[PDB]
Amino acid sequence: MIVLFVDFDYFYAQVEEVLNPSLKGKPVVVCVFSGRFEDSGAVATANYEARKFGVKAGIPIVEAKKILPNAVYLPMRKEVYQQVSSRIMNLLREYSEKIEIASIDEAYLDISDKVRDYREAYNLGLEIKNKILEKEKITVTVGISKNKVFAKIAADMAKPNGIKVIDDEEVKRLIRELDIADVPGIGNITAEKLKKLGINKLVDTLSIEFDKLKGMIGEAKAKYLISLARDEYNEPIRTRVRKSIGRIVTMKRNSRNLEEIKPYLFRAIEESYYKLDKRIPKAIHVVAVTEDLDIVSRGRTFPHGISKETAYSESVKLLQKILEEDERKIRRIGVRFSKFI
DNA sequence: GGGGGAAGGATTC
DNA sequence: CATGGAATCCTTCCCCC
Numbered sequence A: 001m002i003v004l005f006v007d008f009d010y011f012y013a014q015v016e017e018v019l020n021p022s023l024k025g026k027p028v029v030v031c032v033f034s035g036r037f038e039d040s041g042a043v044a045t046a047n048y049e050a051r052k053f054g055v056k057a058g059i060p061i062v063e064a065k066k067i068l069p070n071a072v073y074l075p076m077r078k079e080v081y082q083q084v085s086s087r088i089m090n091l092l093r094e095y096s097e098k099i100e101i102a103s104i105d106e107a108y109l110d111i112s113d114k115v116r117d118y119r120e121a122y123n124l125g126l127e128i129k130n131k132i133l134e135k136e137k138i139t140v141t142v143g144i145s146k147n148k149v150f151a152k153i154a155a156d157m158a159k160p161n162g163i164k165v166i167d168d169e170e171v172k173r174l175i176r177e178l179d180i181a182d183v184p185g186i187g188n189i190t191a192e193k194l195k196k197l198g199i200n201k202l203v204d205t206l207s208i209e210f211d212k213l214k215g216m217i218g219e220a221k222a223k224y225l226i227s228l229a230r231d232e233y234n235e236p237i238r239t240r241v242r243k244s245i246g247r248i249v250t251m252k253r254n255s256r257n258l259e260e261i262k263p264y265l266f267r268a269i270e271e272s273y274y275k276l277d278k279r280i281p282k283a284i285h286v287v288a289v290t291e292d293l294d295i296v297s298r299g300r301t302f303p304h305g306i307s308k309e310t311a312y313s314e315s316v317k318l319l320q321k322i323l324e325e326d327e328r329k330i331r332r333i334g335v336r337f338s339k340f341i
Numbered sequence B: 001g002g003g004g005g006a007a008g009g010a011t012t013c
Numbered sequence C: 001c002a003t004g005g006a007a008t009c010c011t012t013c014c015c016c017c
């Protein structure tokens, strides 16, 4: 089995560059403005020019403007990036029937029944990067290995605008030297727990009694990591389907007032239903982000689909439940619909 | 004991 | 200071044969 992972370079920003080439060259910062104060919000992402000075996804626009006060700042245009993505995604389909679209800019392809070896996989890679570059003018990074996991790691090493292969020879070397924290699905919280257990490299998971690993990080993560170090990780490329659709917004100011919060919530439901586009959910959740950035949600499943009408009143109940049960203020409020018929 | 769904949350990207 | 959409997994209940 041969997997080929494709990850579009600094996507949102590069899309902005494509639409207005004049940007090419200057540091571009695509940010999500939260309507609170001036320039309140976080950075969705930035092109590498800006990344060099520490302006990256996650940080306050405010901190960004402080570092690069003269960089170009754009308001994230999701639908646009989304449509561009869908196109780039379609091209890959022309390279493999089996395609797993991981995110707005990631895809895995099972190029087993199309290639015989890694030399040919690499070629197919270059051929792909080139296609997308002509058709859309979008630079992407390619990763190629024996399984999805190492395929991604491959790309992680090669970006930006790179193409790398991780042959069975290197796969073994990495299992031995790759910092466990660079393994997908291993965030800070998990990586730190792994340190305390002494586990610092994929292999290290072998030097520990299973059960203790399962207790410290969970059975799922355990079996996953272990199957990686044992070189037996082999999950197939599966077409994934949307199981949930929601939307959350940020309020001008924190609140615990049902009448002041209702609007925001009702707005979230509006967009949510619009995105359902003929999809009917039997489950609704009200999600709330407390002033101290904590997250609490209250949901409910129904034996029948949900009308917007229903969703409206039901969501007010759950919000009331949140308020009655959580003394803190609410910073962000939203809804999430799932369990589509 | 144990299947199985629901709810609230944790963690990742 | 701190956006935001969505998947997967974990723990705890709960109904019940």
Ligand SMILES: Nc1ncnc2c1ncn2[C@H]1C[C@H](O)[C@@H](COP(=O)(O)OP(=O)(O)OP(=O)(O)O)O1
Binding pocket: A007, A008, A009, A010, A011, A012, A013, A043, A044, A045, A046, A057, A058, A104, A105, A159, A160, C003, C004
């Ligand atoms: N914190 C975030 N908030 C909103 N959108 C985000 C955030 N982080 C990432 N994204 C989105 C926009 C990114 O361009 C996109 C695709 O891949 P991702 O690796 O996350 O970013 P990227 O393309 O900018 O980085 P890279 O060029 O290093 O691969 O995901």
Ligand SMILES: [Ca+2]
Binding pocket: A007, A008, A009, A010, A011, A105
């Ligand atoms: Ca990317």
Ligand SMILES: [Ca+2]
Binding pocket: A007, A008, A103, A105, A106
């Ligand atoms: Ca990505």
Ligand SMILES: [Ca+2]
Binding pocket: A181, A182, A183, A186, A187, A188
């Ligand atoms: Ca990591």
